[PDB]
Amino acid sequence: GSSGSSGGYPNGTSAALRETGVIEKLLTSYGFIQCSERQARLFFHCSQYNGNLQDLKVGDDVEFEVSSDRRTGKPIAVKLVKISGPSSG
Numbered sequence: 001g002s003s004g005s006s007g008g009y010p011n012g013t014s015a016a017l018r019e020t021g022v023i024e025k026l027l028t029s030y031g032f033i034q035c036s037e038r039q040a041r042l043f044f045h046c047s048q049y050n051g052n053l054q055d056l057k058v059g060d061d062v063e064f065e066v067s068s069d070r071r072t073g074k075p076i077a078v079k080l081v082k083i084s085g086p087s088s089g
Contacts (some may be wrong), residue, residue, distance in 0.1 A: 018063050020083060026058045033062060033077055042066070044077035051082055060084070 010016045021042065030045040031053075044064055046053050046073035056062070061084060062079035 016065060018065050019077075020061060020063045023056065023058045023060050023062060024054065026053075031056070031058070033064060033080075034074045040075075042075065042077045044080050049080040049082075051085075056082065 003065065007065075019035060019037055021033045021035040021037065023031055025032040028046075030043065030047075032067055033042045033044050034040075035042055042064070044062075049056060060082070062080055063083050064080040066075050067078045068074070069076050
């Protein structure tokens with residue numbers, strides 16, 4: 001066939017829009033992020049966050065992507081990523 005790495009997102013007509021808010025609540029299993037754009041409290045799973053929840057905390061800005069679940073179809077956060085942190089990787 002051919003080679004390549006998912007071309008160069010965004011892919012498909014509909015692109016991916018990342019939203020930013022704040023960590024309203026946080027737990028050992030997951031946490032909630034208060035969207036400062038839609039004024040709604042989102043629910044992000046500890047799995048979404050790429051970094052280490054340890055670093056994360058309640059009251060810190062974070063970037064995520066609003067998606068739709070498959071069990072409830074509700075707007076949940078995914079692939080969370082702390083905004084502040086220009087540190088290399």
